[PDB]
Design a binder for this molecule. Sequence first.
Ligand SMILES: Nc1ncnc2c1ncn2[C@@H]1O[C@H](CSCC[C@H](N)C(=O)O)[C@@H](O)[C@H]1O
Ligand SMILES: [Ca+2]
Length: 331
Amino acid sequence: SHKILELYSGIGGMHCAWKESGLDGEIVAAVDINTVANSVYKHNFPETNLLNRNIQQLTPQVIKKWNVDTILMSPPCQPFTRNGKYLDDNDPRTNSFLYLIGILDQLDNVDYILMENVKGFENSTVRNLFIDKLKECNFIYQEFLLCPSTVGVPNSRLRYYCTARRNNLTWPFKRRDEIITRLPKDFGVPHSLESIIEEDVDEKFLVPEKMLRCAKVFDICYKTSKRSCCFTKAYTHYADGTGSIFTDKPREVVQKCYAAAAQNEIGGEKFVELFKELKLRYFTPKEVLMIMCFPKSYNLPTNISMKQCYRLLGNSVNVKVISELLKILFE
Ligand SMILES: Nc1ncnc2c1ncn2[C@@H]1O[C@H](CSCC[C@H](N)C(=O)O)[C@@H](O)[C@H]1O
Ligand SMILES: [Ca+2]
């Protein structure tokens, strides 16, 4: 019944979320300029129209012929300016979102829009313009600031959301101008991480010594943990702010090591030997996929490397949160 245009499709978290919603619709087109991401997307959705094309090459005309009524989009935060000068409009690394805001008034068929964005977008000049273009085009909307930890998922991933909708379609949802911090539906307390952890985990995921020098700023998780830090694209590149670290050892054991390592030179030789025996390891791409609520049928190609995997995973969406917003957007 619904024709979806999936912009900045990435590895296709939106597509995964549309399925989880139970809603009637097809993805008629997914648009992304990243060849690796596209390859991952094609692997899981061989059937889906995937276009290696710039968002700015997308015309109202071609969007109209596709007969899309629904847009799913997660535009990245990219610059418009570098050290005093405007970035070029055909440089692939400049923000493309302004183009969308422009062409909105001529997307006559588009009825439903869902966008994910970074925390802080809601305070941006772009956001103010974007909302302003919605009102102009007779769209009604709700903005959210949601974390998966409120949707019963043991992970932090604070993101901005906007569910925008044409006002001539009856929307039962009691919207409001102030930002919503949690959905009306209560999911209770996030489950532990045991459901999503494998026993036969390869030693390649063990945190390396150079990394173990930065042990002081690691956030550690255990099987009983009901939370974890936000995974980024820099997970396993740097030790810090990039995501949580896991161990099978009791948290009490972890504390003794930290104490014993405190009576040593930081990042030191003796400092590292103590942390080496904690068996700290990264989450596997599979685990991160389960953490981000992708389905088990969803798998990654073995032809792409670990570093590629984590970069792609760090840019993706939580499938569960979007599925819940899709339900709200279409009620
Ligand atoms: N101008 C543009 N046209 C098409 N795709 C673009 C683009 N600018 C950035 N992108 C792509 O959009 C992605 C944004 S990250 C969001 C990806 C997606 N939500 C997922 O589940 O993975 C990046 O991977 C980037 O390759
Ligand atoms: Ca216009």
